Swiss-Prot record, chain A:
This is Origin recognition complex subunit 2. Present with 1700 molecules/cell in log phase SD medium. Belongs to the ORC2 family. Component of the origin recognition complex (ORC) composed of at least ORC1, ORC2, ORC3, ORC4, ORC5 and ORC6. Interacts with MCM10 and TAH11. The lineage of its organism: Eukaryota, Fungi, Dikarya, Ascomycota, Saccharomycotina. The chain holds residues 236 to 496 of 620 of the full protein. Component of the origin recognition complex (ORC) that binds origins of replication. It has a role in both chromosomal replication and mating type transcriptional silencing. Binds to the ARS consensus sequence (ACS) of origins of replication.
UniProtKB/Swiss-Prot annotation, chain B:
Component of the origin recognition complex (ORC) that binds origins of replication. It has a role in both chromosomal replication and mating type transcriptional silencing. Binds to the ARS consensus sequence (ACS) of origins of replication. This subunit is a candidate for the mediation of ATP-dependent binding of ORC to origins. May also be a substrate targeting component of a cullin-RING-based E3 ubiquitin-protein ligase complex RTT101(MMS1-ORC5). This is Origin recognition complex subunit 5. Present with 768 molecules/cell in log phase SD medium. It comes from the Eukaryota.
UniProtKB/Swiss-Prot annotation, chain C:
GO terms for biological process: DNA replication initiation; pre-replicative complex assembly involved in nuclear cell cycle DNA replication; silent mating-type cassette heterochromatin formation. One of its GO terms (molecular function) is DNA replication origin binding. It is found in: Nucleus. Belongs to the ORC3 family. This is Origin recognition complex subunit 3. Component of the origin recognition complex (ORC) that binds origins of replication. It has a role in both chromosomal replication and mating type transcriptional silencing. Binds to the ARS consensus sequence (ACS) of origins of replication. One of its GO terms (cellular component) is nuclear origin of replication recognition complex. InterPro entries: EF_Hand_1_Ca_BS (IPR018247), ORC3 (IPR020795), ORC3_N (IPR045667), ORC_WH_C (IPR040855). It comes from Saccharomyces cerevisiae (strain ATCC 204508 / S288c). Pfam families: ORC3_N, ORC_WH_C. It comes from the Eukaryota. Keywords: Acetylation, DNA replication, DNA-binding, Nucleus. Component of the origin recognition complex (ORC) composed of at least ORC1, ORC2, ORC3, ORC4, ORC5 and ORC6. Interacts with ORC6. The gene is ORC3.
UniProtKB/Swiss-Prot annotation, chain D:
Component of the origin recognition complex (ORC) composed of at least ORC1, ORC2, ORC3, ORC4, ORC5 and ORC6. Interacts with ORC3, ORC5 and TAH11. The chain holds residues 271 to 427 of 435 of the full protein. Present with 2970 molecules/cell in log phase SD medium. It is found in: Nucleus. The lineage of its organism: Eukaryota, Fungi, Dikarya, Ascomycota, Saccharomycotina. This is Origin recognition complex subunit 6. Belongs to the ORC6 family.
Length: 248, 93, 544, 157
């Protein structure tokens, strides 16, 4: 159908013009009709049975990467995990079962705030309210509020200057499932987490799914994030993240 | 600016002031295995002078394709330019 | 279910270093603890000098900003290449109050908000040092009547390239109205990140003529003359002097990745050096041998893996052409004076020849290969001092056991990955990800995303979704799928759906649609409609 | 040169006897023949396609002795230019790089890479640690253990 497949030759080659005599006007009316229950049943059968063993072997292979992840987190690098397939079980098992009690033992657990980026109901004001319920920072003075400023960003900027002069002990484990999700990708929300990622006392563990996600960050945001990138491809079913996208 | 940012800006001007149909005539320089005919280019020279008008809108993938078409350059060297995270960081900048 | 919620806090239960045991699990725990302590004593030694360099560059930038600022018109200062992070502190001029007003494009939606924020800041500062007023330019008019002293306002515009230039222009002519008051001095600071030709074409010509009467350019950045950078690199070299070697490929990768970042290249350099030091103290069991205290427990595995060395093999081939543990200890006392040679060449360039615009990283690269003369030929001033400034790079046996190198592709996988290309090569190949060891189905049937990405790649730019479903359906064996779906007899609805004659047309369709919405979530495909779902077009091509 | 002439027509005997010059098994040569027969009527220079297919098959089939000895990589490509009437070497490299993207996503090529454990030159146990960002991966600084053993045997002989 085309002479080139990849690179820019393939991109320009596959953008030809197709005549209306080969329009291929087939539709989804000519499809076997399905509803929620049988689709869910047979889908979960293939997710729990088809290629479960080599996925588990790959998961046990990437369990050995966890001390390197902890060593990267204690040096001030934020963790970003990418790859085809879901990464929710990886981040929940790494942060809660492994990273939190071993960080707690190495500084003699550490709370884990978990953010669901696949949910469009995620909001930076409520998340920062939970952050201030955990870290209990010093409240902003009248002169620091300025003139109709964003109180969240100003209070994080106060916390950055406060936490420069603290002992470098990790007080909080922040997990961001799907950093590139729909409500969560916005510039205010990314500014808030980059400013939180400046603080050495918060460990940032995040995942991503969109292939254009490095476009989200400029030089200032990438400097504040300070990412170490890790390719974890596992072909997980993405059972939970699909619940906010009606597949029917 | 960096070399990546300057070539991304140059590719952006190319994407904004050329038509997408004529891209296969200017940048295509690859040997063909499967039989196929390259684009002929524009048939007649128009007199609009498109740099006097407002720029047109383009997509990300056309920008990256033209960017690696115009970027400066045995079996493992990978001559062309990949769209890694620093190209996207420069574009965000 | 907390997974169906936005944000939830959990507290893990509890019933200590991340360094692992090397030498295939044969390394002792004392070597692991020593390697941890040696990594921290090098890491802190490097970052203390980094902290002193960052404090010095901030203090010098404050000093030159104050020198330009204090030496019936504005006093204009264009800080070129400024990332708007400087704290501009003002001296307490006697009998006059100096007020700093900072303005963000988010704080500047229009001229009225700019004036109201500026006048609130002015009144707050004046009351904080020395009845309320209207937040308006009449406060500038009556400032001496209300506070006794006169006024000096310094406006710092954060991120001028992102501001609306009409709003900034109208604010400049609005501030021009304060020149008729005898007790007012106004200075403007523009933090420009592109260049001055972008900002002179967005302002009006009367504004340019207004700003021309008293203006100073100041090109202050991180790439300005390479000074700050070379100091960080020299601090890293002084950290690793006498113990570690830098490879030429590592230095050229530093130069290549630091070429692609202009505004924030310094902390990128610190990041790459940090990850290299982390990699060396995580990988190599000989990291404990960089100090002479820990040479007392070299075992058989150490002697086994130091015998697989190209330099040692060349050395013993030379000895057998001409003509073990103590001899290996003997290669630790040597100096490797290339770092002292580089700092001596840098000092000779700096305070003899008055040459400051040199890159010490690229100088170290040319010293590592041995092309220092071609690098020094450019200045046309070292023609007669080139022979004394040149020294041959010495070759030392077992250098590659103490070496920051870049041969495996680790440092370009963790810090600068080919993210999109990594996704594409994972989706297209897929046997490089999953292990080849539903016992029959995994050897004949592909995963649905990898099987779909092949027909994604070999189709055209616009894809009809039903023919794409048919091409997906022809790649699946229906008999083995129906045999695998009948493997579990404990699910009644699966068995009553499998014996229905259109079961495969249900199964392949729903696996196809879950892969299609997975592709839509990753951003590979899009729909060329809002109400219809009949045609897709692809946005991702491999290799770009 | 054979890489320049166009619109050639070939027999199956020529393909299967050119496959036996580089010591390939029968099923790999049959898959080379079938990959030629699929793209028979939609082809410009068949000599490039056959040359690059037998190349990309014989790096995979002979990967372990290429790990044993590097100059065999300079031996197979030297045998090819002595048969394709081509003076320079870079045309053959551009040819194999051009034909590589045509068979990369296919089932038989994936099964060949699985069965002979090529995976672009390295085992699965190495590539799964190189893509994970494992710093404990085997860097290309020290020689292998088998190379050290055969070098010590060469010294002792």
């Amino acid at each position: 159908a085309s002479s080139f497949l990849d690179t820019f030759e393939g991109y320009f080659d596959q953008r030809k013009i197709v005549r209306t005599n080969a329009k291929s006007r087939h539709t989804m009316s000519m499809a076997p009709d399905v509803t929620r229950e049988e689709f869910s049943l047979v889908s979960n059968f293939f997710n729990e049975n088809f290629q479960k063993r080599p996925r588990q072997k790959l998961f046990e292979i990437q369990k050995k990467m966890f001390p390197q992840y902890w060593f990267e987190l204690t040096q001030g690098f934020s963790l970003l995990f990418y790859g085809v397939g879901s990464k929710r079980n990886f981040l929940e098992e790494f942060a809660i079962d492994y990273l939190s009690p071993k960080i707690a033992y190495s500084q003699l657990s550490i709370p884990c705030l978990i953010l669901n980026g696949y949910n469009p109901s995620c909001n930076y004001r409520d998340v920062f309210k939970e952050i201030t319920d955990l870290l209990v920072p010093a409240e902003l003075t009248r002169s620091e509020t300025k003139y109709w400023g964003n109180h969240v960003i100003l209070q994080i900027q106060k916390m950055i200057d406060f936490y420069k002069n603290q002992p470098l002990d990790i007080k909080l484990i922040l997990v961001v499932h799907n950093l590139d999700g729909p409500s969560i990708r916005k510039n205010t929300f990314q500014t808030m987490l980059s400013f939180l990622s400046v603080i050495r006392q918060i460990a940032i563990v995040a995942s991503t799914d969109h292939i254009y996600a490095p476009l989200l960050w400029d030089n200032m945001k990438a400097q504040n994030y300070n990412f170490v990138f890790h390719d974890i491809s596992n072909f997980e079913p993405s059972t939970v993240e699909s619940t906010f996208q009606d597949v029917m | 600016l960096s070399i990546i940012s300057k070539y991304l800006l140059i590719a952006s001007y190319i994407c904004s002031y050329l038509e997408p149909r004529y891209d296969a005539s200017i940048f295509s320089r690859k040997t063909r295995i499967i039989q196929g005919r390259a684009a002929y280019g524009r048939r007649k020279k128009k007199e609009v002078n498109p740099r006097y008008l407002q720029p047109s809108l383009f997509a990300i993938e056309r920008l990256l394709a033209i960017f690696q078409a115009i970027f400066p350059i045995a079996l493992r060297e990978e001559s062309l330019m990949k769209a890694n995270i620093e190209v996207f960081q420069n574009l965000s900048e | 279910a907390d997974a169906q919620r936005s944000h939830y806090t959990v507290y893990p239960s509890l019933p200590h270093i991340p360094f692992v045991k090397l030498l295939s699990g044969k390394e002792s725990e004392v070597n692991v603890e020593k390697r941890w302590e040696l990594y921290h004593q090098l890491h802190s030694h490097f970052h203390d000098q980094v902290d002193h360099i960052i404090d010095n560059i901030e203090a010098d930038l404050k000093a030159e900003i104050s020198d330009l600022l204090y030496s019936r018109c504005f006093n204009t200062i264009f800080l070129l290449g400024s990332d708007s992070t400087t704290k501009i502190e003002l001296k307490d001029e006697s009998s006059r109050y100096n007020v700093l007003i900072e303005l963000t494009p988010k704080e500047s939606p229009n001229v009225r908000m700019m004036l109201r924020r500026s006048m609130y800041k002015l009144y707050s500062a004046a009351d904080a040092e020395e009845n309320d007023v209207s937040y308006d330019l009449s406060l500038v008019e009556n400032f001496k009547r209300l506070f006794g002293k006169d006024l000096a306002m310094v406006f710092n515009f954060k991120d001028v390239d992102s501001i609306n230039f009409n709003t900034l222009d109208n604010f400049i002519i609005l501030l021009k109205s304060a020149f008729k008051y005898d007790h007012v001095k106004i200075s403007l600071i523009f933090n420009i990140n592109t260049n001055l030709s972008n900002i002179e074409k967005n302002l009006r010509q009367s504004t340019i003529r207004l700003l021309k009467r008293n203006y100073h350019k100041l090109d202050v950045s991180s790439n300005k003359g390479f000074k700050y950078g070379n100091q960080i690199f020299q601090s890293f070299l002084d950290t690793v002097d006498g113990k570690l070697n830098l490879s030429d490929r590592f230095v050229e990768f530093i130069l290549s990745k630091m070429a692609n970042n202009t505004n924030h290249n310094l902390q990128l350099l610190t990041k790459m050096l940090d990850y290299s030091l982390m990699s060396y103290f995580f990988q190599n069991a000989f990291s404990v041998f960089i100090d002479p205290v820990n040479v007392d427990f070299l075992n058989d595995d150490y002697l086994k893996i130091l015998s697989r060395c190209p330099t040692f093999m060349f050395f013993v081939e030379g000895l057998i052409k001409q003509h073990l543990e103590e001899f290996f200890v003997e290669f630790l006392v040597r100096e490797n004076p290339i770092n002292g040679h580089a700092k001596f060449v840098a000092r000779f360039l700096e305070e003899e020849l008055n040459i400051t615009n040199f890159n010490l990283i690229e100088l170290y690269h040319n010293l590592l290969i041995g092309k220092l003369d071609s690098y020094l030929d450019r200045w046309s001033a070292c023609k007669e001092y080139k022979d004394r400034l040149h020294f041959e790079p010495i070759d030392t046996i077992f250098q590659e056991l103490f070496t920051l190198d870049n041969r495996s592709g680790l440092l370009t996988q963790s810090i600068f990955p080919s993210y999109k290309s990594n996704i594409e090569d994972n989706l297209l190949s897929w046997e490089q990800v999953l292990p080849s060891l539903s016992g029959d189905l995994d050897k004949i049937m592909a995963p649905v995303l990898g099987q779909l990405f092949k027909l994604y790649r070999e189709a055209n730019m616009t894809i009809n979704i039903y023919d794409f479903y048919i091409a997906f359906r022809e790649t699946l064996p229906k008999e083995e799928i129906l045999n695998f779906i009948r493997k579990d007899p404990s699910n009644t609805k699966l068995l009553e759906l499998a014996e229905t004659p259109d079961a495969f047309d249900k199964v392949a369709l729903i696996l196809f649609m879950q892969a299609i919405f997975a592709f839509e979530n990753m951003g590979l495909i899009k729909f060329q409609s809002t109400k219809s779902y009949d045609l897709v077009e692809k946005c991702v091509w491999r290799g770009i | 040169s054979l890489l320049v002439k166009k619109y050639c027509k070939m027999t199956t005997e020529e393909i299967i006897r050119l496959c036996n010059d580089f010591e390939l098994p029968r099923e790999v040569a049959y898959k080379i023949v079938d990959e030629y027969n699929i793209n028979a009527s939609r082809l410009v220079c068949p000599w490039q396609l056959v040359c690059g297919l037998v190349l990309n098959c014989t790096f995979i089939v002979f990967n372990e002795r290429r790990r044993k000895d590097p100059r065999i990589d300079h031996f197979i490509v030297s045998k090819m230019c002595s048969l394709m009437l081509t003076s320079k070497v870079d045309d053959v490299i551009e040819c194999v790089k051009l034909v590589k993207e045509l068979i990369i996503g296919e089932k038989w090529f994936r099964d060949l890479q699985i069965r002979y454990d090529d995976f672009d030159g390295i085992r699965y146990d190495e590539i799964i640690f190189r893509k994970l960002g494992s710093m404990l991966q085997t860097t290309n600084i020290l020689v292998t253990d088998d190379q050290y053993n055969i070098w010590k045997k060469r010294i002792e002989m």
